[PDB]
Amino acid sequence: MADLSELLKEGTKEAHDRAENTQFVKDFLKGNIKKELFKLATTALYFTYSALEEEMERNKDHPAFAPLYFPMELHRKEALTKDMEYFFGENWEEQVQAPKAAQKYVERIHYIGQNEPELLVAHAYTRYMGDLSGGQVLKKVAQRALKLPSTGEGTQFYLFENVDNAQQFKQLYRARMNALDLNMKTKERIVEEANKAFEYNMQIFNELDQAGSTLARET
Amino acid sequence: RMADLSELLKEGTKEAHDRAENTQFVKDFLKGNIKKELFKLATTALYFTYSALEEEMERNKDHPAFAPLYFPMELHRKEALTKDMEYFFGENWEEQVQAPKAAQKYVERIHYIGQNEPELLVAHAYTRYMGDLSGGQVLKKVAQRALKLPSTGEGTQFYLFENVDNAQQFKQLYRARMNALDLNMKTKERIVEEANKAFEYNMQIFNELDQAGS
Ligand code: HEM
Numbered sequence: 229m230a231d232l233s234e235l236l237k238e239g240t241k242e243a244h245d246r247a248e249n250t251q252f253v254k255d256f257l258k259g260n261i262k263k264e265l266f267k268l269a270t271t272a273l274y275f276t277y278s279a280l281e282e283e284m285e286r287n288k289d290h291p292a293f294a295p296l297y298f299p300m301e302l303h304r305k306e307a308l309t310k311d312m313e314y315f316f317g318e319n320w321e322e323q324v325q326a327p328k329a330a331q332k333y334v335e336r337i338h339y340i341g342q343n344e345p346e347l348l349v350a351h352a353y354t355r356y357m358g359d360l361s362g363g364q365v366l367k368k369v370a371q372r373a374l375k376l377p378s379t380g381e382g383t384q385f386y387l388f389e390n391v392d393n394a395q396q397f398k399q400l401y402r403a404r405m406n407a408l409d410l411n412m413k414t415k416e417r418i419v420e421e422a423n424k425a426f427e428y429n430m431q432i433f434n435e436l437d438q439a440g441s442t443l444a445r446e447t
Numbered sequence: 448r449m450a451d452l453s454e455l456l457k458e459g460t461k462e463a464h465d466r467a468e469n470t471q472f473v474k475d476f477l478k479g480n481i482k483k484e485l486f487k488l489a490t491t492a493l494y495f496t497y498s499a500l501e502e503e504m505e506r507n508k509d510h511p512a513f514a515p516l517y518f519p520m521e522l523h524r525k526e527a528l529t530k531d532m533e534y535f536f537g538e539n540w541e542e543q544v545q546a547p548k549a550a551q552k553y554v555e556r557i558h559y560i561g562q563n564e565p566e567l568l569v570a571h572a573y574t575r576y577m578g579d580l581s582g583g584q585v586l587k588k589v590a591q592r593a594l595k596l597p598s599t600g601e602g603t604q605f606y607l608f609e610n611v612d613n614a615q616q617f618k619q620l621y622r623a624r625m626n627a628l629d630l631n632m633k634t635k636e637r638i639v640e641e642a643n644k645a646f647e648y649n650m651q652i653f654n655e656l657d658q659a660g661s
């Protein structure tokens with residue numbers, strides 16, 4: 229009956245609103261986030277996106293994912309690697325681990341990309357559609373809050389230097405999702421997997437929240 | 448010999464097994480960090496999962512695509528699990544207990560496969576029992592040490608195969624029977640995919656049990 233993009237928008241309303249209501253997000257938007265906590269979040273992002281982009285690369289020619297493959301426009305790994313150099317140093321990859329909640333999310337991404345790639349759209353939609361929407365605001369907030377350089381270092385993740393217009397690209401992306409040949413069953417499963425994706429993001433946030441509480445006991 | 452189902456399953460589920468080996472709950476279990484109540488939840492998930500699995504194997508016991516793999520006496524865990532449930536919860540353990548959300552999904556899938564695609568039931572037996580026969584002894588000793596359980600086996604009877612004299616040899620018998628099934632290459636590949644699903648159902652139970660850990 230309805231488009232996948234609408235099924236997704238409507239089917240993830242509840243989960244999207246709970247994501248806005250998380251303590252970590254409220255403290256972020258209002259500008260009260262501290263360096264070492266931003267570093268854990270950036271780390272969470274790096275491992276998340278590394279897996280996601282590895283799995284999209286795997287399925288770049290899969291008819292159930294091919295139209296959503298935008299390496300040059302959307303991919304965040306390169307940017308996040310630059311952000312990890314700035315915060316952690318030169319040999320960061322040798323020493324940093326993926327936080328537990330991020331590791332769970334990563335595990336799920338690898339499963340989906342390797343075994344049920346028709347559901348990978350759910351993880352791409354959840355992640356990239358959000359990035360394009362709020363990217364400009366969060367970049368400005370974090371820079372001012374942490375006294376970061378205006379030239380961009382430390383926030384490369386939030387800048388899409390190959391998207392000329394975010395709104396127009398979102399429109400493009402929705403139309404590509406809707407063109408995918410899918411049963412009503414597979415569509416329902418995709419919506420269910422996006423809600424799972426949000427729940428993984430929730431776990432990540434409240435991990436950071438409780439990591440911030442142990443950050444406050446020390447300081 | 449790489450066309451043999453047992454090879455196809457081992458090569459085909461390698462990535463999934465690596466994931467299972469390194470997941471947070473499994474690592475925390477092996478270190479001895481899992482406590483009594485969380486072990487009671489873990490066992491609960493096992494009970495419902497194996498009830499479903501052993502019901503569907505009982506149903507398909509005569510099906511040509513599964514029959515040789517029917518081992519109620521050697522493999523079935525339901526009776527062992529029941530005794531473990533009794534030991535931790537007491538006599539009225541049934542009314543004390545409910546299946547965790549992720550276990551329900553696993554159970555629902557087992558029933559579907561057993562009722563609608565019986566040719567893929569081997570994928571579920573493979574994933575569960577072959578794992579059980581490989582690590583049970585270690586898991587048992589870990590559980591006993593962490594929870595101060597008796598050496599006589601109370602609470603860990605799930606991990607002991609009383610009617611299997613040699614796990615290693617029995618696994619080889621099982622592999623040989625899997626390879627003996629009259630199956631085309633298309634069905635074999637569908638078995639490998641379901642086996643990967645099976646692993647992920649376990650991943651979700653592990654992931655939920657870790658959440659309960661907090
Ligand atoms: C930091 C708090 C957040 C705020 C204030 C926020 C705000 C917004 C806004 C204003 C939109 C525009 C709706 C539109 O596209 O017309 C949007 C879209 C979206 N957001 Fe968020 N967001 C937040 C966090 C998140 C998180 C954590 C996720 C999950 C990864 C997420 C996922 C999405 C998705 C998938 C869309 C596109 C929906 C669609 O148009 O189909 N957002 N967000």
Ligand code: HEM
Binds near residue numbers: 473477574
């Ligand atoms: C630290 C955790 C684990 C370790 C160290 C471990 C170890 C092993 C090892 C060494 C084998 C090889 C036995 C052989 O080929 O003779 C094996 C077999 C197997 N394991 Fe695991 N295991 C773990 C967890 C799991 C889990 C969670 C599952 C899924 C529920 C699983 C499923 C299997 C299966 C299906 C086999 C048979 C492979 C085959 O021979 O085809 N294992 N395990």
